[PDB]
């Protein structure tokens, strides 16, 4: 088999719908084909193979895929999604008879069902007396995306999703800082489309 | 086999020549070199079917790679380039794609030693207006100023390593972008309830793992000769 294709670097699931990662080859005759995952930052593990038995093939987890020749292909699925699926899975095929050949990987990313958002910004102050602090963005739903700074001394992060075990509760939070004297929480997040009912505390 | 990678972190001034050995016990005749990329998967570098027998894969400029028994594959970065910062991986395979992988090799190149710098790490303790609001205490954790972008972060409760309730960026910020050698920062989260905040016997570390120079590396500058090392940073729960 001469190629591997999994179209979509990053994408995006709904905690609790199903998943559903596309792989496909090019291969004239029909090859034996590989799913692979990776939790940061670790190493491979094998979720399943197609090896010319079964075409339904089934994995640890949940996950299945089935092997389907006539539109060239094998995607994964797992019946719902949990934050624990989060990582990044590569599709792989044989090649010349002599090797396993990957396919660029793609990262699933799960959305949280946030039932009570709570959008706000709040500040919070070094342990240490400096007064350093940090503005941290919690609390809002799949709706809300947020955007690079456009500052170059305000730096912001990526939105990061925390599942609290010990109350079953998770949530998305960003965080900005800044060295800038006259930077403020109020304006952090200017550049990101926020909830209107974010709440901003004095 | 078990198949085992040396070593497993390292870190190099370009124009060195670096070498990652592979060894396996089970004897199987096949064993390769991949890379990975994010972005890209895992290239083949190199393979070799048998100790006779070595054939290129598709990114096997600037390596070389020696077969020098049944048991062992090594590969050489023959003059080291900052492209070539990767995670390395070998794998054996007997004849039926029944591949194992080794843990992983990560390795960075940097230009320019001089630039090696550790972590300012610094905790950020929760909001009244959180607690007030929410019941819920969220702490913020923020690695400045490292250089290579090579660390691993972890919180630490009462002395033991906790996992339940963290969020820690995947990938560092640049604090210069337009800047090739930008040193990085990197953030996390801990959230506990406001319960478990506000009792003064808890105790909340960061801990950041770096990874740099060696007692090896000569070292020229006054600053502290900026050595692999850990740096944390913690804050005590607080009634009031």
């Known amino acids: 088999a001469q190629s591997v294709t999994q179209l979509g670097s990053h994408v995006s699931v709904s905690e609790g719908a199903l998943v559903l990662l596309r792989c496909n080859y090019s291969?004239?005759?029909?090859?034996?084909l590989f799913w692979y995952v990776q939790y940061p930052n670790q190493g491979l593990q094998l979720l399943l193979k197609?090896?010319?038995?079964?075409?339904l093939v089934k994995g640890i987890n949940g996950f299945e895929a089935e092997f389907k020749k006539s539109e060239t292909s094998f995607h994964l699925t797992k019946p719902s999604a949990h934050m624990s699926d989060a990582a990044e899975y590569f599709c792989?095929?044989?090649?010349?008879?002599?090797?396993?050949?990957f396919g660029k990987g793609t990262r699933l990313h799960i959305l949280p069902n946030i039932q009570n958002p709570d959008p706000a910004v709040y500040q919070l102050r070094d342990s240490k007396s400096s007064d350093k602090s940090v503005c941290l963005f919690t609390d809002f739903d799949s709706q809300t995306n947020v955007s690079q700074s456009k500052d170059s001394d305000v730096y912001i992060t990526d939105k990061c999703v925390l599942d609290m075990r010990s109350m079953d509760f998770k949530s998305n939070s960003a965080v900005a800082w800044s060295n800038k004297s006259d930077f403020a929480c109020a304006n952090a997040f200017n550049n990101s489309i926020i909830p209107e009912d974010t709440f901003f505390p004095s | 086999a078990d198949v085992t990678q040396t070593p497993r972190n390292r870190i190099t001034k370009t124009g060195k020549r670096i070498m990652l050995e592979c060894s396996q016990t089970?004897?199987?005749?096949?064993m390769y070199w991949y890379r990975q990329d994010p972005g890209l998967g895992l290239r083949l570098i190199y393979y070799?079917?048998?100790?006779?027998?070595?054939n290129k894969g598709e990114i096997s400029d600037g390596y070389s790679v020696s077969r020098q028994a049944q048991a062992k594959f090594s590969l050489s970065l023959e003059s080291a380039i900052p492209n070539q910062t990767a995670l390395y991986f070998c794998?054996?395979?007997?004849?039926?794609?029944?591949?194992?992988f080794g843990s992983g090799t990560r390795l960075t190149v940097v230009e320019d030693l001089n630039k090696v710098s550790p972590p300012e790490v610094a905790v950020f303790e929760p909001s009244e207006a959180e607690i007030s609001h929410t019941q819920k205490a969220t702490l913020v954790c923020l690695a400045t100023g490292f250089y290579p972008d090579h660390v691993e972060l972890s919180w630490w409760v009462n002395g033991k390593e906790v996992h339940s309730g963290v969020c820690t960026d995947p990938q560092p910020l640049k604090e210069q972008p337009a800047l090739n050698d930008s040193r990085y920062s990197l953030s996390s989260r801990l959230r506990v309830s406001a319960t478990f905040w506000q009792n003064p016997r808890n105790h909340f570390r960061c801990q950041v793992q770096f990874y740099g120079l060696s007692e090896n590396d000569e070292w020229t500058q006054d600053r502290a000769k900026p050595v692999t090392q850990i740096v944390s940073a913690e804050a005590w729960g607080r009634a009031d």
């Open positions: 794998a054996t395979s007997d004849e039926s794609y029944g591949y194992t």
């Open positions: 792989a095929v044989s090649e010349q008879d002599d090797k396993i050949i």
């Open positions: 197609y090896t010319s038995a079964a075409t």
């Open positions: 291969s004239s005759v029909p090859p034996y």
């Open positions: 070799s079917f048998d100790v006779k027998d070595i």
């Open positions: 089970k004897g199987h005749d096949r």
